[PDB]
Ligand binder design. Structure first.
Ligand SMILES: [Zn+2]
Ligand SMILES: [Zn+2]
Length: 79
């Protein structure tokens, strides 16, 4: 019983979305804003420094299509 019902919480990557968050096969959409590099270049003329892209929370990837299994998060508690 307890042998199968392994009631000892642990996190697992959603293998189905390969731990990302986008539906299987349907990979996360490369954030164009930061050219998939996770950082936007604040090209205010000379001072062309960068900022973390908020749109994709610096991950450079947009969960356009959320992996239902993990509600687009990308990882879940073993269950
Ligand atoms: Zn998933
Ligand atoms: Zn981005």
């Amino acid at each position: 019983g307890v042998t199968k019902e392994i009631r000892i919480p642990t996190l697992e990557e959603c293998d189905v979305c390969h731990g990302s968050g986008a539906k299987p096969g349907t990979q996360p959409q490369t954030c164009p804003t930061c050219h998939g590099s996770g950082q936007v270049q604040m090209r205010q003329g000379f001072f062309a420094v960068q900022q973390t892209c908020p749109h994709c929370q610096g991950r450079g990837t947009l969960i356009k299509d959320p992996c239902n299994k993990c509600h687009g998060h990308g990882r879940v508690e073993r269950s």
